[PDB]
Design a protein that fits this description.
The PDB classes it as lyase. Keywords: acetoacetate decarboxylase, Schiff base intermediate, Lyase. The entry is titled "Crystal structure of acetoacetate decarboxylase from Chromobacterium violaceum in complex with acetyl acetone Schiff base intermediate". The structure is cut from a larger assembly and holds 6 copies of chain A. By secondary structure, chain A is mainly beta. Chain A has a single domain, classed as Acetoacetate decarboxylase-like (Beta Barrel), CATH 2.40.400.10. The first copy, chain A, has 4 helices and 16 strands. In chain A, strands 1, 2, 3, 4, 5, 6, 10, 11, 12, 13, 15 and 16 form a 12-stranded mixed sheet that branches. The longest helix of chain A is centred in the middle third of the chain and has 11 residues. Chains A and B meet through helix 1, helix 3, strand 6, strand 11 and strand 12 of A and helix 1, helix 3, strand 6, strand 11 and strand 12 of B.
Chain lengths: ~240, ~240, ~240, ~240, ~240, ~240
């Protein structure tokens, strides 16, 4: 509690009982429903921050169950991710995520710079159908469906996809409201072990919301639906571009 | 979207739909129940970061209703504040807070460096008693009671505290886990219009929790209780010590 | 604790934690629905204690919301008031009241000698109708209705009644059952700020009950209905006749 | 309704339909759980009104079911009572009681001067355990437990205890707020018929409350627990000391 | 059925349909939350039977889920365990245990001498917190919490802890009420496989109860908390000291 | 807590807070519904342990409410009882019993050797019918019905069946699984006061269950139904035949 021990001990607020712990952040049996859809290219351009370059005019809309996550607990996630290139390198940009557990929400924002907001994601099998849903308070803003494990998915393509760089725009205001942090961050998921992976026919419907504008990239054509279960490690990011 | 527009628009993540808006953050009919209690001085020193210095060994345990908040909505808060001095100026230090609404939560942390976690605070009149509760998941970690408006409080004497400085240790990790922001912040509540203020007898019980350790400052005796309602602006804060200079 | 301190501290039981606190008893946004009805004059004389004298043969049946009361909390009341004169001064006599909160109940009785019993009064707007109800245990003993704010009322004319004296027969047994306190009390509501007042059509039905005999003054015809909201102080009362002099 | 008939008829408010009737107050099958505990002697001294003298630094914490009570009905009670002497005579002082029925609450206060407040007492057998509880609105302020009828209790000691004088500080304000009544009252329970009486291991926990400060005499050590069922008559009090 | 068949078939009551079966008792995915706290040494000395010897003034308070238990079914346990020495060997003494399933309750008492009573133990993750509770009828008697999986635990230390002897005082009355069995019993859990093991911050609160007096070992200071999942076999015990 | 205290204190586990107290075990307003049915004689001989001998081929199927039981609490029982001779003397053998309260279940098994298992017995009047039911988990295994108090029953004859010896086969395993106790126990209900006794038409239906096999003694023909209320003392039993 001397000034030097404060510098040394500081990690997250509150100092003496921080809102989230340090890693490694290990995920066991995270379960993904991802519905990939073609959207209006004009709508991607309108939200994409340079130096990031646009790729195919597609959105990957995700529902993730994370029943066993070190330091964070048991939670679910929904999100919009978009394919991009940075220095001609191919990866992903996360536009929006929604979580129902606070430690991964604060940790996500403050540490990597995931653009997390609060919401009620669910991902469940109802007899014959895998149903993904997202509510923001009392308003349903996303409903995804897939058939159940119709065909095995190619592990190669999947593992190569999970290996790609993931980019995020970390912004943190200074006490005065002006940006104190404002960088592009690259992170990876590593030690990936697939437990199973499948495709099936899929569907997505999005709904408008003032505070959760997923509907701003409209579902013109659903292209594919993938469902998979894996263990992985969410590695710390590194800054690849600093706006300041 | 060119990289100069990115730098202009940037306030909070996500860039194009921020988790919370800029102020001013106005508060109408903000309602307080504050229970002051004498605790173990050793427990206070364990948690107080220098150059902050300890005053009287008391905790002000608070429950707050905020039904009307610009940009944040309608929410409640409970938390633990202690009397402090910095450079021999008297003020408060916020040790822990707990809210049931996300924008004020992210906002609180990312902007001022309020030490916010999620919780279920309640403050409700039950016939003759004003009851403050805090639950953390299924566990009750704080229960406070007061009589209802027994004695009108010296209002002029109240604004005596509502004008003094509030200190916070703002900490934000860098991507690698080492601190990127680590500073003491001084903020003020300004524009304070008191609608009523009262004292009455009071009680408090706190329960242990691994992730909400309010009970760590133990309730040795209750000293006072106050209930008040007001309008108020939460002004943006200032750095008054930067640990990473 | 010496017997002089006992005599100084003594206000209400229990000595060290009284069932209700001293005033002033301030009331904010006190809301009234009052249904006035013509009853059998004989029924009024059966229950009116001399030297009180009967005026017009009417009952003002009231339902009152008191969401903000110093020392008492948040409660409701329903009861039966009659026009009276004492020494040719016009005022009211309270025949029966019913409350859902204990401190105002003990307070009411022990201090002023309000004739309070326990009950479940409600006063709520249901779309187009203002509905007053009183239940005594599982039994509905009073239902009142009004239209909603049809005609604004002459406010100056209203304070005409809110300034006149209210009489109560205060009775407290001695330990042996014979009366130790038995007096007529005059109290006033002062500091009265009316926020709104209205009239509309009205109805009333009352049902028998062995222990809540409101129906004993039967509803022969409804004469008027009024609805109003106000701030108000219930001043401490005065003895104006002592039956045990 | 002439002034003379008012004097004659007056008993309790309201005059013509009084809030509680006159006696005799007869109790059939009242059922007691009493947990006796040692407390801080300093805490008794702080609430004890002289001429009353302190005795052993113990509190008897009671839960009473009264299913059949003349003039009052069917109700439950919880309370703190403390052993005292008055003129070297041994008996009891009632610090706090809580009831869930209005006639015995008004009657109790106005007639004997029991220090009654409102609350939700319960006393119930749950399989193997006698559970006493007290709530004050939404806050539990007392929880007592006992085993079920482990051993028969000595009737002698019990009957001698129920025969002891019971003292109360009756206070009633005058219309102006200053004491109009302020006396020590002595009353007895008579025509006592025990139907059964037992002991077992017992427990008590108290919780703080601004308006119901039972916790102000802390449970240092539980000394005993007694459970008993009896008929009795609650006799009128007599004033043994008048402060005015 | 002849007298000889009776002895040959006799295992547990009822003879022809025993309340629990013979082993081996195998456990799959046993999940533990153990909070270790410092207590009053005099409070342990009050309850530890010689020839057992006290070690540290420490209590290991446990919440255990047993979803898959051969012979017994699917149940939960909460218990209070004291480090002891006996004949130069470090071990544990089981003071109290509470279970929500009858065959392992009768089985544990009558076979090993586990000190078991009935209760409602729970152990569940609520978002970011692991929460352990025990109710005895309507009364909460224990609440424990841990962070979720903050850091990995030394698996070698854990296995050595699961290898130490576990001592129980088995008592069974004769028909006349005098002891027919009164003996110290030693048992082990063997064939142990750790599926995972973590530490994190922890808390415990205990409440008094007349029939489940876990609160008689007060929580002066919480020392550690551990959370693990394992398979094991509860082996039959052996007598190590016969009091008769 | 010394060695020689251990064998003086020791009655039931846990040593310091036993699962059930010593007696006398006193029952007030024990209410019985007994349906007597003729069964397959071969089914009785299959379960009857020599030196016990079969009498009439009947079963007495019981539903018992025990609202007031010293040391045990308030609970219900259902069970199967057969007439028997031992050494030419007429008594009963208890085949099977089910209780909803732990202290009397442990106490019954460990002390007398009643063949007690957990279940949910109920006995209640529904308008015109006395209905006894027994559930074992989600499964109904016994439903009995009687008319309500059709004719007063000869008490002097009743009181006699209540003086007959009751025999039990007490079995307790040793820590190694071999029988440590295996004996016929004789016990009596004494100090009996019949408060009323009645007969009426009756019915009984039984359903199979793997772990509660009452249906193994099939209901061939219902012979009689009896309903009665009483106070009694369950005396400690005596060993009348030790298999070991």
């Amino acid at each position: 509690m001397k000034q030097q021990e404060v510098r040394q001990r500081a990690f997250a607020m509150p100092l003496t009982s921080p809102a989230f712990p340090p890693g490694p952040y290990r995920f066991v049996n995270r379960e993904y429903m991802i519905i990939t859809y073609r959207t209006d290219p004009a709508a991607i351009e309108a939200v994409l921050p340079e130096p990031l370059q646009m790729a195919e005019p597609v959105v990957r809309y995700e529902f993730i169950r994370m029943p066993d996550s070190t330091g964070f607990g048991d939670y679910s996630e929904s999100g919009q991710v978009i394919p991009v290139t940075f220095r001609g390198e191919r990866g992903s940009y996360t536009l929006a995520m929604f979580l129902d557990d606070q430690p991964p929400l604060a940790g996500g924002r403050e540490l990597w710079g995931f653009p997390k907001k609060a919401g009620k994601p669910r991902l469940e099998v109802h007899q014959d159908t895998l149903v993904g849903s997202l509510d923001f308070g009392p308003v349903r803003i996303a409903t995804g469906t897939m058939g159940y494990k119709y065909e095995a998915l190619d592990r190669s393509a999947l593992l190569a996809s999970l290996a790609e760089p993931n980019f995020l725009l970390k912004i943190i205001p200074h006490v005065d409201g002006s940006p104190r942090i404002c960088e592009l961050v690259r992170y990876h998921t590593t030690d990936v072990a697939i437990k199973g992976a499948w495709s099936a026919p899929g569907s997505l419907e999005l709904h408008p919301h003032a505070l959760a504008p997923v509907a701003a990239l409209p579902v013109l054509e659903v292209l594919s639906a993938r469902h998979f279960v894996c263990d992985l490690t969410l590695d710390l990011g590194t800054v690849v571009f600093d706006y300041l």
